[PDB]
From a paper:
Voltage-gated sodium channels are transmembrane proteins responsible for the generation of action potentials in excitable cells and play important roles in the propagation of electrical impulses throughout nerves. They are complexes of a pore-forming α subunit and auxiliary β subunits, designated β1/β1B–β4 (encoded by SCN1B–4B). In addition to the channel modulation, the β subunits function as cell adhesion molecules. In this study, we determined the crystal structures of the mouse and human β4ex proteins containing all three Cys residues, which revealed the formation of a dimer in a parallel arrangement, mediated by the intermolecular disulfide bond and the exchange of the N-terminal segments.
In this study, a slightly different all-Cys construct of the mouse β4ex protein with a C-terminal tag sequence was prepared. This sample was crystallized under different conditions than those employed in the previous analysis, and the crystal structure was determined in the cubic crystal form at 3.1-Å resolution. The same parallel arrangement was also observed in the previous monoclinic crystal form in addition to the anti-parallel arrangement. The anti-parallel arrangement was not observed in the cubic and hexagonal crystal forms, probably because PEG fragments were bound to the trans homophilic interface (hexagonal form) and because detergent was used for the crystallization and the C-terminal tag sequence was present (cubic form) (see “Experimental Procedures”). The parallel arrangement of the β4 molecules was mediated, in common, through two types of interactions. First, the β4ex structure forms the intermolecular disulfide bond (the S–S interaction) between the “unpaired” Cys residue (Cys58) in the loop connecting strands B and C. Second, the N-terminal segment Ser30-Val35, which is deleted in another structure of β4ex, is involved in an intermolecular interaction between the two β4ex molecules in the parallel arrangement. This type of interaction is designated hereafter as the N–N interaction. Moreover, in this N–N interaction, the N-terminal segments form hydrogen bonds between their Glu32 and Ser34 with Ser56 and Thr54, respectively, and join the β sheets of the counterparts.
Residue numbers in the entry:
A (entry chain A): 30 to 106, 111 to 135, 140 to 155
B (entry chain B): 30 to 104, 111 to 135, 143 to 162
The structure:
């Protein structure tokens, strides 16, 4: 089997007020334990946590524990931890980091540029 | 043995006259040899295979076989090509396939103002 992909980092442009999906799927040929992940947000000034979560196993799916932005929604059918950020605002521009945990310490980065409707 | 990806498709906005890196990476959990890869360019006016070659294995750098113009070169085994001195004509769909799926990059060449309206 093979897993060809674009990489861990991509840039994405989205219209203010719309919804945007920040993608992250992960793969292990190992098979695994409980598997921890989290979405953080960064800019020049500060950084906040968006959601954290767990996949009980490859046979189950990614489920969320912590949620600090009600606009975040995690849904996807490679297990996929992509999230859908709704009700976009201009201050949502920044870097969205998705970190994963069975050592393991792999992260995916999404640079999100919010633009106006013209 | 944990790999993360932001998908098999992305869009890339690139600056005219600048240089862009078109990313493709592949993972496997078996050792592989003679893994053949190709890059194809698809445009409204034309379709063409950019470059191809093989990664002999995880040991070595990839060996390019079919070469494209002067202006595509090659860089967790990494197949990403670098496109230098972009021109608007380079806009199109760049697809990287690894023969035994593929990653698709939709490259839009643009230009940027120095600033926004009236800076300090």
């Amino acid at each position: 089997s093979l897993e060809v992909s674009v990489g861990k980092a991509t840039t994405i442009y989205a219209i203010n007020g719309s919804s945007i999906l920040l993608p992250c799927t992960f793969s292990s040929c190992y098979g695994f334990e409980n598997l921890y992940f989290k979405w953080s947000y960064n800019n020049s000034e500060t950084s906040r946590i968006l959601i954290d979560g767990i996949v009980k196993n490859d046979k189950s799916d990614p489920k969320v524990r912590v949620k600090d932005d009600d606009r975040i929604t995690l849904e996807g059918s490679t297990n996929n931890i992509s999230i859908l950020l709704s009700d976009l605002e201009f201050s949502d521009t920044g870097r969205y980091t998705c970190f994963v945990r069975n050592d393991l310490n792999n992260s995916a980065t999404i640079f999100l540029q919010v633009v106006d409707k013209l």
